[PDB]
Design a protein around this ligand. Structure first.
Ligand SMILES: CCCCCCCC/C=C\CCCCCCCC(=O)OC[C@H](O)CO
Ligand SMILES: CCCCCCCC/C=C\CCCCCCCC(=O)OC[C@H](O)CO
Ligand SMILES: CCCCCCCC/C=C\CCCCCCCC(=O)OC[C@H](O)CO
Ligand SMILES: CCCCCCCC/C=C\CCCCCCCC(=O)OC[C@H](O)CO
Ligand SMILES: CCCCCCCC/C=C\CCCCCCCC(=O)OC[C@H](O)CO
Ligand SMILES: CCCCCCCC/C=C\CCCCCCCC(=O)OC[C@H](O)CO
Ligand code: NA
Lengths: 114, 105, 117
C-alpha cells in the first residue's frame, strides 16, 4: 500500500497544479460537475448517463496529458532556446477532438432523449 | 495552437489520414444504421478516440525529436509506449464495433 | 499509401507493451485489474451498449497509463542532460491516469448499481 499514497499525492499535486495554472482546466472541471448534475437530474438511462459524464471526463484526461507535454516542451525551452512549437500544436489538436467528441455525444444523446 | 496541429498530422502522418477518414466513415455509417443514441455515440467516439491518442503519440514523438535524437533507449521507449497507447485505442475501437454489430445481427 | 509499414508500427507497439509491463509496476497492476474487469464484462448478462462501456472505460485506463509512461520516459531522457527536475510534467501525467481510473470506477458503479436495482 506504500506506493499508492505516493502516486495519489503526485496525482493530487498534479491536479491542484493544473487548477491554479490552467484556466481551461478550471472550465473543464466546471463542465464535469454540470455534466454530472445535468446527467443525474435528467431522467435518462445509464448508458446515456455514463456517456454524458465520460465524454466530458475525457476532455479532462486529455487537457491533463497536453499539459504534461506542454510542461516538457517548456523545460527544453529554457535550455535549447528553440521555438519549435510542433508538439504543443499536436497536443492541442488532441484536446480539440476530445471536445468535439463530447459535443457530438451530448447532441446525439440529448437529441434522442428529447 | 489547435488547428495548426491537425493540418500537420494530415500532411505528415499517413495513419492519421487513415484514421481521419475512418472517423467520417464511422460517422456516416453510424448515422446510416438504425440504432439508438448510446449505440451511435459509441460507434463514433471509439473511432474518434483512436484519432485523439494518435495525436498525443504524435506530440510525444515530436518532443523526442526536438531533443537531438542521437541514440538513447529512453527516446525509443517513449515513441514505442506512445505507439502502444494508439494500439490499445485501435484494439478498443475494433472490439467496440464488433460487440455492437455482432449484437446488431 | 504504404501499407507494408503497418507491421513496422505494430512491432513498435508490441515493443511498447512489453516495455511497459517489464518496467512500470503500475502498468502491471492496473493491467491485472483491467484484464479481470474486461473478462467479467464478457460473462455478465448486460446489453451491448452496457458491455462496451464496461470494457472501454477500463481500457482507457490502460491507454492513459501508457501515454503517462511515454511521457515519463521523455522526462527521464531530459534527466540525463539537465540536473533539476520539477516533476511537474510527471505529476500531470499521474493526474491523467487518476481521472481515467475514477471514470472507470464511476462508469462501473453507475452501470452496475443502475442496471442491477
Ligand atoms: C454520479 C456520481 C458522480 C461522482 C463525482 C464525479 C467526480 C469527477 C472526477 C474528478 C474531478 C476532478 C477535480 C479536480 C480538482 C483539482 C484540485 C483543485 O482544484 O484544488 C484547488 C486548489 O487547491 C485551490 O488552491
Ligand atoms: C436544456 C437542454 C438540456 C441540457 C443541455 C446541456 C445544457 C448545459 C450545457 C452543457 C453542459 C456541459 C457538457 C457539454 C458537453 C461538452 C463539454 C466540453 O467538451 O467542454 C469543453 C471544455 O469546457 C472547454 O474548456
Ligand atoms: C470480441 C471481439 C474480439 C476482436 C479482437 C480483435 C483483435 C485484432 C484487432 C486489431 C487489428 C490489429 C491492428 C494493428 C495496428 C498497429 C498499428 C499501430 O499501432 O500504429 C500506431 C503507430 O505508432 C502510429 O502512431
Ligand atoms: C470505420 C469503423 C472502423 C472500426 C474499427 C477500427 C477503429 C480504429 C480506426 C481506424 C484504424 C486506422 C488504422 C490505420 C493503420 C494502422 C495504424 C497506424 O498507425 O498505421 C501506421 C501505418 O504506417 C499506416 O499505413
Ligand atoms: C454497486 C457498486 C459497484 C462498485 C464497483 C467498484 C469497482 C469498479 C471496477 C473497476 C474499476 C477499476 C478498473 C481499472 C483499473 C484501475 C487500477 C486499480 O484500481 O489499481 C489498483 C491497484 O492495482 C491496487 O494495488
Ligand atoms: C470488477 C473489476 C475487477 C478488478 C477490480 C479492481 C478494483 C479497483 C478499484 C478501485 C481502485 C482505485 C485506486 C486509485 C488509486 C490512485 C491511482 C493513481 O494515482 O495512479 C497514478 C499513478 O501514477 C499511476 O502510475
Ligand atoms: Na508516429
Amino acid at each position: 500500500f506504500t506506493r499508492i499514497i505516493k502516486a495519489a499525492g503526485y496525482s493530487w499535486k498534479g491536479l491542484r497544479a493544473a487548477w491554479i495554472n490552467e484556466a481551461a482546466f478550471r472550465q473543464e472541471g466546471v463542465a464535469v460537475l454540470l455534466a454530472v448534475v445535468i446527467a443525474c437530474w435528467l431522467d435518462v438511462d445509464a448508458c446515456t448517463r455514463v456517456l454524458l459524464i465520460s465524454s466530458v471526463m475525457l476532455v479532462m484526461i486529455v487537457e491533463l496529458l497536453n499539459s504534461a507535454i506542454e510542461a516538457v516542451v517548456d523545460r527544453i525551452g529554457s535550455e535549447y532556446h528553440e521555438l519549435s512549437g510542433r508538439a504543443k500544436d499536436l497536443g492541442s489538436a488532441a484536446v480539440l477532438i476530445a471536445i468535439i467528441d463530447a459535443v457530438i455525444t451530448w447532441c446525439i444523446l440529448l437529441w434522442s432523449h428529447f
